[PDB]
Amino acid sequence: SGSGEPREEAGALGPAWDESQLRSYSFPTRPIPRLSQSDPRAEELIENEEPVVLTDTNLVYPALKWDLEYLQENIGNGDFSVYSASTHKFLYYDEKKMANFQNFKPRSNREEMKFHEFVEKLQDIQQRGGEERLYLQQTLNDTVGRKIVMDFLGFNWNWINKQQGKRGWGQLTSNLLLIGMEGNVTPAHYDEQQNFFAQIKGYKRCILFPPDQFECLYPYPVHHPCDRQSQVDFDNPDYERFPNFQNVVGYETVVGPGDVLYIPMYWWHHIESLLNGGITITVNFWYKGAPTPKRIEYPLKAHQKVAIMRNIEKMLGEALGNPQEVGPLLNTMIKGRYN
Amino acid sequence: SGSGEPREEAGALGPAWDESQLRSYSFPTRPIPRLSQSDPRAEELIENEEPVVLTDTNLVYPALKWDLEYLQENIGNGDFSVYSASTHKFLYYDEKKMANFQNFKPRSNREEMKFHEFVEKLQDIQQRGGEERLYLQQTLNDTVGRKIVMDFLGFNWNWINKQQGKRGWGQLTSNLLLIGMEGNVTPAHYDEQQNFFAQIKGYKRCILFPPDQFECLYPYPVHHPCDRQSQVDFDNPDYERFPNFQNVVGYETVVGPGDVLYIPMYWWHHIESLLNGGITITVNFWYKGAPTPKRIEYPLKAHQKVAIMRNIEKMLGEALGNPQEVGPLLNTMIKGRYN
Ligand SMILES: O=C(O)c1ccc(O)c2ncccc12
Ligand SMILES: O=C(O)c1ccc(O)c2ncccc12
Ligand SMILES: [Fe+3]
Numbered sequence: 204s205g206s207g208e209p210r211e212e213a214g215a216l217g218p219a220w221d222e223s224q225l226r227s228y229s230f231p232t233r234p235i236p237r238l239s240q241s242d243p244r245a246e247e248l249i250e251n252e253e254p255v256v257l258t259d260t261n262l263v264y265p266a267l268k269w270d271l272e273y274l275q276e277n278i279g280n281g282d283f284s285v286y287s288a289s290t291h292k293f294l295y296y297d298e299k300k301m302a303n304f305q306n307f308k309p310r311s312n313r314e315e316m317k318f319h320e321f322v323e324k325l326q327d328i329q330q331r332g333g334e335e336r337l338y339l340q341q342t343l344n345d346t347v348g349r350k351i352v353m354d355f356l357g358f359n360w361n362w363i364n365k366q367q368g369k370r371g372w373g374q375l376t377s378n379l380l381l382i383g384m385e386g387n388v389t390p391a392h393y394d395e396q397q398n399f400f401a402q403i404k405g406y407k408r409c410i411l412f413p414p415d416q417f418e419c420l421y422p423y424p425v426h427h428p429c430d431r432q433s434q435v436d437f438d439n440p441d442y443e444r445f446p447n448f449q450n451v452v453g454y455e456t457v458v459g460p461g462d463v464l465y466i467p468m469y470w471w472h473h474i475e476s477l478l479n480g481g482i483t484i485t486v487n488f489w490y491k492g493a494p495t496p497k498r499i500e501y502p503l504k505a506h507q508k509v510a511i512m513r514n515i516e517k518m519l520g521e522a523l524g525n526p527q528e529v530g531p532l533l534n535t536m537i538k539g540r541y542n
Numbered sequence: 543s544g545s546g547e548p549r550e551e552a553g554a555l556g557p558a559w560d561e562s563q564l565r566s567y568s569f570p571t572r573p574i575p576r577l578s579q580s581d582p583r584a585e586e587l588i589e590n591e592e593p594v595v596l597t598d599t600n601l602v603y604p605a606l607k608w609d610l611e612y613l614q615e616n617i618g619n620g621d622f623s624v625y626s627a628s629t630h631k632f633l634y635y636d637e638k639k640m641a642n643f644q645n646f647k648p649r650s651n652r653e654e655m656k657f658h659e660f661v662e663k664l665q666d667i668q669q670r671g672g673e674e675r676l677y678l679q680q681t682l683n684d685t686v687g688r689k690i691v692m693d694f695l696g697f698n699w700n701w702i703n704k705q706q707g708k709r710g711w712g713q714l715t716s717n718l719l720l721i722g723m724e725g726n727v728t729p730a731h732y733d734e735q736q737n738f739f740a741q742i743k744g745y746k747r748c749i750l751f752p753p754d755q756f757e758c759l760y761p762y763p764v765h766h767p768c769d770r771q772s773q774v775d776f777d778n779p780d781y782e783r784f785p786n787f788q789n790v791v792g793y794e795t796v797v798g799p800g801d802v803l804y805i806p807m808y809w810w811h812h813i814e815s816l817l818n819g820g821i822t823i824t825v826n827f828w829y830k831g832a833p834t835p836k837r838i839e840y841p842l843k844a845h846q847k848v849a850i851m852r853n854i855e856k857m858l859g860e861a862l863g864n865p866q867e868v869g870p871l872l873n874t875m876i877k878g879r880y881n
């Protein structure tokens with residue numbers, strides 16, 4: 204069914220959200236299980252690298268207070284990466300890879316600024332009834348206000364640290380603070396690290412796809428700036444170019460304040476802030492996955508095959524001396540021989 | 543035009559052969575230049591790795607005498623690999639790779655036997671008006687008769703050894719004695735070693751294709767028993783499966799007693815013994831090519847790209863643990879992403 208029947212907020216404050224706040228798509232979805240961190244099942248899902256929503260971790264308990272006013276007040280004077288877009292879909296791209304593809308034009312520009320500037324430009328759009336959408340995504344560093352350092356320390360490091368150990372993951376690569384406008388959408392894509400999506404303010408609809416649905420999502424070429432993202436426009440899927448998108452089946456859920464969504468590495472994920480649901484705030488915890496076992500066991504995992512394909516592409520671009528030639532060589536290699 | 547106007551034999555013994563002895567094919571061809579070993583051009587072609595027919599090397603001068611009677615008389619009692627076929631096309635195959643592909647049925651069986659047995663079974667087919675064709679292909683070793691050792695030593699090792707040095711090639715990997723029936727055909731394929739085709743008895747039509755015509759020839763998958771051979775049936779080309787075969791352009795020539803044809807490594811080659819031209823005898827000299835230069839210069843050579851594709855296939859089959867899965871992964875990797 205999807206995110207299932209809208210949850211009821213405590214104190215009879217009404218339903219947290221309603222179906223009209225969710226965007227419409229052409230594919231079916233099964234619900235991600237919402238469990239308690241003390242539930243053996245949740246521990247089982249995380250181990251078998253499957254998504255799960257933990258409702259009682261208290262991971263970012265101290266931040267549940269956060270809002271635009273509180274943050275602008277105690278966040279600091281550091282710079283904050285802020286992405287913009289003319290549409291609800293934010294098209295991020297690896298700048299370092301822009302060299303490879305020339306005909307590439309940026310649709311999502313980045314810009315550094317002080318928090319008060321973000322809150323400002325955010326307000327201008329409100330009254331001016333603007334169309335421009337903004338999305339703040341900045342790593343949490345020492346340049347943050349004292350109080351924030353208190354909240355940061357308040358996180359349930361006890362719990363997350365145990366998870367990091369029980370799964371044999373690597374070190375916490377980074378923490379990301381995301382603050383977005385209602386309706387904001389992060390197009391389907393996958394990451395190579397294990398992620399804990401800690402929802403703080405507002406609600407976000409999360410739609411995940413297993414790694415084995417690689418052939419239904421059609422990720423951009425590895426050397427392309429949009430590497431790891433799906434080429435398929437979920438709002439207007441081109442079934443002629445991407446026929447297998449008609450076979451895609453996802454797992455979805457709506458996370459709210461206090462919920463932690465485990466997004467396994469290599470798992471595709473589409474994230475959107477509910478329509479007319481106000482701003483959203485999230486903090487992600489990214490951990491390098493566990494080291495690859497010595498004795499390579501077969502059958503091979505889907506994410507492993509994905510890794511293999513990425514390497515073929517990288518090496519090939521290395522050998523040929525030009526990423527632009529990867530496509531022609533691959534075609535030449537399969538045409539009339541493997542297809 | 544192809545092999546051009548038939549050459550005139552000395553002593554007014556008439557034309558060496560006539561066009562009706564050559565099979566008919568759907569592709570055009572340019573003639574391979576026949577030059578003298580003392581001709582600077584020939585030295586230029588061999589250096590730039592292009593085919594050339596040397597008419598005066600005297601490479602296998604002592605063998606120009608050889609025939610079935612002389613050989614059966616002084617060749618020895620060793621075993622001789624003899625391939626058979628129900629058609630004029632000999633379909634060789636790597637037995638060690640037969641494991642990979644199960645549905646593969648042998649069309650060209652091999653069999654060891656004494657030379658006198660080969661000459662015998664060869665005669666039975668004559669009077670019995672049989673259909674079975676035979677092709678003897680055996681490496682020249684010490685188990686050969688004394689006289690043959692004299693002839694072998696008689697070869698112009700002086701010349702070939704200088705070539706091996708001037709080109710920086712590796713050691714002579716092997717020598718192959720080939721004796722085939724008229725009409726016999728060795729389907730288009732390529733080898734990874736430098737080859738000197740020394741014609742001894744009869745005439746053979748040689749049709750070569752540059753390495754850059756890989757996409758027109760459609761070689762079998764690397765793990766397939768017929769690795770390195772073209773899937774295209776030259777007698778009945780399936781233009782639907784192999785559309786680019788309609789763009790193939792070869793280099794051809796007819797070599798006779800005393801001629802040496804340089805067949806560069808990776809160059810495709812189709813060899814056939816002229817129709818109603820009697821038996822043919824040839825001796826090939828195979829040398830590993832020169833070592834790959836340290837500083838990889840670009841643009842890359844076509845044979846280098848071919849090498850790169852072969853490796854991608856090998857490694858991929860290694861990683862996946864099963865050659866049968868190479869095709870599906872490659873398709874998945876390009877479909878909707880590179881084509
Ligand atoms: O927008 C998000 O909340 C989000 C969630 C999870 C991710 O991996 C992201 N990666 C890049 C940009 C945004 C996100
Ligand atoms: O049939 C031939 O004369 C011949 C010539 C050159 C080759 O590389 C071959 N390889 C395998 C079998 C036969 C051949
Ligand atoms: Fe991401």
Ligand SMILES: [Fe+3]
Nearest residue numbers: 731732733811
């Ligand atoms: Fe060969």
